[PDB]
Design a protein around this ligand. Sequence first.
Ligand SMILES: Nc1nc2c(ncn2[C@@H]2O[C@H](COP(=O)(O)CP(=O)(O)OP(=O)(O)O)[C@@H](O)[C@H]2O)c(=O)[nH]1
Ligand SMILES: [Mg+2]
Ligand SMILES: [Zn+2]
Ligand SMILES: [Zn+2]
Ligand SMILES: [Zn+2]
Lengths: 427, 512, 417
Amino acid sequence: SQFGKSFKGRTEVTITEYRSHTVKDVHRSLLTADKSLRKSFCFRNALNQFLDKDLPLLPIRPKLESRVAVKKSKLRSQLSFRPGLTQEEAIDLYNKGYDGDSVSGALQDRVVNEPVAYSSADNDKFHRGLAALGYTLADRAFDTCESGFVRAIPTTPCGFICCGPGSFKDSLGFVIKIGEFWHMYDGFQHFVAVEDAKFLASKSPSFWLAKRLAKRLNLVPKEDPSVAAAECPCKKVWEASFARAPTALDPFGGRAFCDQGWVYHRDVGYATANHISQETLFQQALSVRNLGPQGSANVSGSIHTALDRLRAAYSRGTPASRSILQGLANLITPVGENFECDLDKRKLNIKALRSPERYITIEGLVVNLDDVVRGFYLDKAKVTVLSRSKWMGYEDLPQKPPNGTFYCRKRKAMLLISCSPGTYAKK
Amino acid sequence: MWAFQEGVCKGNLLSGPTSMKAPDSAARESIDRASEIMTGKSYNAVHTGDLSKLPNQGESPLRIVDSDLYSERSCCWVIEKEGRVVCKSTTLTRGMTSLLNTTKCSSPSELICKVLTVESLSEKIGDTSVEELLSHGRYFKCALRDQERGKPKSRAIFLSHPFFRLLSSVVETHARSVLSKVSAVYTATASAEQRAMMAAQVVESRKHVLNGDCTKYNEAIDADTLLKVWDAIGMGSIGVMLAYMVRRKCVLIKDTLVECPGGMLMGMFNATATLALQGTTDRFLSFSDDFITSFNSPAELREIEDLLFASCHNLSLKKSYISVASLEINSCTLTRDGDLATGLGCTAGVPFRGPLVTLKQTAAMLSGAVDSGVMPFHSAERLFQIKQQECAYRYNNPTYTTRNEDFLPTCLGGKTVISFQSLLTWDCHPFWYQVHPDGPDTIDQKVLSVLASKTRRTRLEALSDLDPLVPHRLLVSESDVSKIRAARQAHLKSLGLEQPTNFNYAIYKAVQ
Amino acid sequence: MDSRFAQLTGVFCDDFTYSEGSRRFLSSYSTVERRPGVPVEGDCYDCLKNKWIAFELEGQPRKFPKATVRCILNNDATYVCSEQEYQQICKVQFKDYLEIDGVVKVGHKASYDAELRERLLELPHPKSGPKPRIEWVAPPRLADISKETAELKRQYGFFECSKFLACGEECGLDQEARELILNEYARDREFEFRNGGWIQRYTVASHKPATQKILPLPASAPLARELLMLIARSTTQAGKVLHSDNTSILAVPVMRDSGKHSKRRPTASTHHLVVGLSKPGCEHDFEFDGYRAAVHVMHLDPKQSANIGEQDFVSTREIYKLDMLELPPISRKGDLDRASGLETRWDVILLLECLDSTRVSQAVAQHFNRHRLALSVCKDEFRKGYQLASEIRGTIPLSSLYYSLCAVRLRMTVHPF
RNA sequence: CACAAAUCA
RNA sequence: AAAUCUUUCUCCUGAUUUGUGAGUAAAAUUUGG
Ligand SMILES: Nc1nc2c(ncn2[C@@H]2O[C@H](COP(=O)(O)CP(=O)(O)OP(=O)(O)O)[C@@H](O)[C@H]2O)c(=O)[nH]1
Ligand SMILES: [Mg+2]
Ligand SMILES: [Zn+2]
Ligand SMILES: [Zn+2]
Ligand SMILES: [Zn+2]
């Protein structure tokens, strides 16, 4: 009758409170760790048990052999997007008798950042502790044009959309929003899905493209036979040829080919290389200039505030600046949510307009929209003089300096070139 | 030796200081400092900035995160037996449960809804009233926090009443939301390294950098400033009640209650304190008592000083400095071009805490260091080898190992000195996986956890292995818990399976 | 799914059964009624019609699938639903007017808001305070650190012998001689002997701090690791002589003397007088059977002993050496002496940092890092960051702080930045 | 979500 | 007697990363070279 004592005076309590009450009550003793491990030969017996019973039951993890050339660079943040169990997968695991707490803990799509200062030619992602040695997460690709698909600039184009301007293969699919429906085509099966009050209603959620669309839209897959579309141009669009914008795969593992249309590869699960970087942020913005919301770049803070600042900077500026800002807004706005990414239709916010400086952080990159409007990150570099005395260990200022600290002899001063076109717009 | 480092070094190698002194002295010094500040003789506690531009969140529904109101951390539970106040230290879970039992409430949300919707302060909410809750929620209990490097005198920490925590959670969450909506560069959640990178990018346009810290941060943030910010973000009754409790807070030292009207004691309102500055100007990339503002001319520096003073963010003259070739925030120092400053920096040593815990912690530290440009990989390999040799010297006695297996570490009777690169790239005997930073728990951790749990009554019926979809806010009675357990046991029996098999995401994904 | 309707749903599923006994309506807000492993698409589930039912109000749509039938509750005392049976059940079960509580906003202004605001107004408020005048000047120069060290020396001075620091070097006695010397020293000091172990007995305390002075640096610390390991061992093994490869110690518990019923076994918070041996030549010399050695004591509470023991000496030395500049020779008092200095004294300093449980050296290191990084600092205020002598008390922490300042001064002297 | 380890304020 | 209210019979708030989740009985010498 402990329920009548711990929760005296109440007959019903929340699951949180009950679970928190039934937690092991660990205690802290003044004994050191070594003395505790020595006590009663507890660690000795534990080691004996591990070597006699537990050790044989340890799966043999695979060795890592993939390596790439790496160079020391600025202190960047490696953005890992490790996924969690999907809703249906969680249900299936729970009904199979798996631990509820562990499954629920695994049911969370989390974004993590790791400070690493090391960059490779393709700007890949390295393991924990092996960034110095260039141990990439990606495994060796079997077919060449798969690696071409995952690569921004394929070495050998097979003439098809995966790694060049062309049509689709049998191994590629695409999900495109037509009217009020999401059409998924793979090459054999054409399905239509709808967004039904936090759910993704589709004929068969098990479809790989359907699962990918559910993950992209942040919706729970669901079965709904009463879903159909009137016009299905999926055949013609599949048979047509499209231009391939040079960009790394979005964190979701797909590339945009048309307005609200994303191509996916069956074998490639998720992007292994940092989608957004200093040298590719503006190219990424230009590529999605008029492709609707993409939701591929996480912006620190509030997305509404970022869009307000983008719109305020969008009020003035040259057409190219407006296009760049529209592309950035498309990049940061999620897909399918109540967001007005289109800056033309966005209502101007005076409160976000009066601010003297408009800063937005895209994937840890602080971009000043005011500077972007006046042609800084693309046209001309920003120079600030740090001192008039030469410093030790700093290279001379090149003729077209990139971002960084340099020494200038014509002026005899230490300069800090910022927002240099040679870094962002590296034509 | 930390003095002769060519690069930056915080001297973090050795463990933090330890002190068995009673917390009375430090708490008394903190209270005296707060009272002295209240007199307006040394520091400023009066806010002057314009927070009229903060967005109003008063229309948002009152949502309480229950998970944050229950934990094993200590808290002050107050009892009024015979007109005397008795403050006891109990787990926050026990304090919250006792509060909910005193005033009949299924959940904290119901309690706050009832409190907000009373027609009088004396109206009963069970065996208590809002006036009694306010009176009790202002009491705090002092304690000493040590093992903080660079603080020979251990700091003073304070345990708060469950009601105070319940009311402060709402305001803190909404203040963080307002910070996200208003801050020029959001940092309330970014880590130290992310803040350093953002600062390195932000201050690229100005010649000088002001690496500053705030002194007496908790004592300089009056209840008036907190209520000002809360009213700016529209808290109404919650903000008023919290400010009333803060202004009337009492701290129990030894056996006497001491009034501490000034300041906020603990960092319970770090988000609100940060908003007190971020709401008045956008020139500071700061969170709590850490800002990285930059300037070009002395006039801009004077403007920065005025802004800091007006927002009760008193500059720390002892620690604040000006740099032109670097910038440091949250102990992370970066060059003006973004490169991490050469040197050990925040790298810390691993005290001997177990034959395999020490090796695992050394591996984790070395991986963190090599990932950045702290040291080349071969240096990390050499350091790991030296640490393995030291562990062999320390833990290779019969009281720690009776084995002679070759694959075992030299510190457990074996002859294997694993290479750091071999360990990191899963190129070791499965016995060494636990030693990996991302491997499973070592034998030492399991033994220590068992010893800790094996020290002590009567346990409630278990409620583990729940549906991953059932929200944790649903109400369960004793009969409901029994029925849930019976149903789960019957389902397992029908499947012919014992207690639920543990789930590991890594293995499942590997076999997928 | 809103908890507001939970109670309401409970009224709906009022002992309704189907299939001769099975409950018909399963509430989504009830854990026992909930069907495991099924997503929730409504306030309750009807098995007979296999349909999800959700409840709404006028002009308050709820996020649910279109397939979920909505029992819209009109402003008037009427319930309208697409399904006739559900509407009839709504009319029947909801006989007593169930007014759903309105959602409470964060900005809710309670009836006592004005009263609490008045009470707060009548309470004390702070005063403005002064605006500091900040003068930005160059960081402290070598002269300032020299002044700090000179002030420390003048105020406290130096000890005649290194005291326990001398225990970092071999005492020149074999294991048997060391054990005999330690046991006879304990016996001479009238230490109580019980169960084959030594216990130190005390009756009254002066309640005043012990004398503070700076410990001169021994030549080297070959036994730093051994001494720290012995200290770690002595956390629980107290009252008996603990031996090592090249040295030995004796941790005598210090326990109160009641006189008849006195503490016999040490408890969690019993302090230890750690006794160690070093080469003779100081006032602490002890002789027995022709064996002479300097016996040095150190009083440690359990936390200090654990902290000192857990430290690793070799690894810290190597990590520091990874990016260290050429350490200069220093004299017995941490002063640059090229002619007759010893570099090994630096090891001793490190050992001191390990023995100093207050770790004031960490504070000095942080301040020196700021100094090296800084270009301009507040006048007369940044310099007042090395004055940590008021933060610590004891011979060991005082010596550690003094030698941290000496290291800073030496860095500014030989390797200017 | 809870516990444990490291770091930061 | 010393690192002197101790030798007397618990450590707050928030954040980043990582790993685990029905595994159940006193006390500091027993037992670390
Ligand atoms: N409740 C806690 N707040 C902390 C803690 N550490 C830091 N802080 C917060 O950060 C603030 C600054 O504390 P620091 O760690 O910088 C201590 P410092 O000696 O530099 O403070 P001053 O006395 O103002 O010089 C402190 O007032 C709190 O608001 C902690 O352990 N607990
Ligand atoms: Mg700082
Ligand atoms: Zn191809
Ligand atoms: Zn179609
Ligand atoms: Zn002596």
